[PDB]
């Protein structure tokens, strides 16, 4: 009964909810706002139009008024549910989120800077320090890209994973829980972390040294392992995973760092106090009755990410930012890339989540195709000359996002409504 609150933008009040932030915000919008007059952009409309002519999906998603940009609550919840699950690792034995894995890599990175930084005490503290750590990481990445050796992976992507065209599942299956040798060879973060001594021995990356054989023989033994244990023993005790051997945590953690780097880059582009371009107002979401250096990213860290992690430590980056997942997947799809060769993968996963015909394995395969697009699109967006410009272009052309204030809400909601139909 004690209400929960999240803060999205500094110019806005906090948003009240009981247990499910996104679900309750969506429900309030359909109950209090004139949704029939809204647009959610052409990407959402094209999805509605495509489904409208398919009787099964028209019924499941309660589609009505074929030539209206407005979408049903059922369709909106369907899309959002698919996006939220993108970086969820749905195995019975998943003990860490992509966010906690990213926090361990970042604490190890901070220690490896050798600048006398105050050691963080927990994942919550590392999250609190993202506004200080991410600019340093972004500077190091920019230097690593400028001095890049050998070829760049397909799509000018510096954050690429080298998977076989036949790889259909995200879970690592080589020698237990490792990805095939060479999977991380062209990934800028892995190259940087290996250069800074964050990662010392990564199976399938580089060559086995005499020191690994000596460690295996004598037992006399690593920055990543030390920081993973320090941050996660409170949560897991003795059962702390070794990221270099349970590579799903290494890969999800790296993808989450790429996601955080992109969020830090685009969220701080302009002030929420500057004159508005778009038509969205908080009243479109909650109803009329209910309502220097740019630091929009720090505001989200303190009033959204931090409080969510405190109440639900299983939270993943796609559950926090389903709009980021929609942008990244769309960037990959539009580029012509396909994980089956190395098309609506969001809609494909929505269908797999609702249909009783799909077994667990088929649903996982469709989930993993969406996640492969997500990783590729995220890497593409972060690798372009001006990431803000490409994100701005996709936002205004497809997702009804026209300024920084609308971008911030879109990233957190997975959609952006505004009055499109007026007398």
Author numbering: 1 to 221, 224 to 293, 315 to 365, 385 to 465
Question: What do the authors report?
Answer:
Herpesviruses cause severe diseases particularly in immunocompromised patients. Both genome packaging and release from the capsid require a unique portal channel occupying one of the 12 capsid vertices. Recent symmetry-relaxed cryo-EM reconstruction strategies of α- and γ-herpesviral virions provided first snapshots of the unique portal vertex that is essential for DNA encapsidation and release. These studies revealed for the first time a pentameric cap on top of the portal that presumably seals the capsids against DNA leakage after packaging and has been proposed to consist of pUL25 in HSV-1 and its ortholog pORF19 in KSHV. Here, we report the crystal structures of the CTDs of pUL25 orthologs from 3 members of the β- and γ-herpesviruses (HCMV, KSHV, and murid gammaherpesvirus 68 (MuHV-68)), highlighting their structural conservation across the herpesvirus subfamilies. The overall structures of the HSV-1, HCMV, KSHV, and MuHV-68 orthologs are well conserved as reflected by high z scores resulting from structural comparisons using the Dali server and in spite of a low amino acid identity within the “twilight zone” (approximately 20% between the crystallized fragments of HSV-1 pUL25 and MuHV-68 pORF19; illustrated in the structural alignment in S3 Fig).
We also present the structure of its β-herpesviral ortholog, revealing a striking structural similarity to its α- and γ-herpesviral counterparts despite apparent differences in capsid association. HCMV pUL77 is considered the ortholog of pUL25, but despite biochemical evidence indicating its association with capsids, the analogous positions around the penton vertices are occupied by a dense layer of the β-herpesvirus–specific phosphoprotein pp150. Similar to HSV-1 pUL25CTD, pUL77CTD and pORF19MCTD crystallized as a monomer. The striking structural similarity between pUL77 and its α- and γ-herpesvirus orthologs suggests a conserved function, in line with the essential role described for the CVSC in genome encapsidation and capsid maturation. The crystal structure of the HSV-1 pUL25 CTD displays a remarkable charge distribution with a number of positively charged residues on one face of the molecule (blue in S4A Fig) and a cluster of negatively charged residues on the opposite face. A similar but more pronounced polarization in the electrostatic potential was observed in pUL77CTD, whereas the corresponding surfaces of the γ-herpesviral orthologs did not reveal any accumulation of charged residues. The striking structural conservation between pORF19, pUL25, and their β-herpesviral ortholog pUL77 most likely indicates an evolutionary conserved function that depends on this conserved structure. pUL77 associates with HCMV capsids residing in the nucleus and is also found in extracellular virions, but unlike in α- and γ-herpesviruses, symmetrical cryo-EM reconstructions of β-herpesviruses do not reveal any density that could correspond to the pUL77 globular domain.
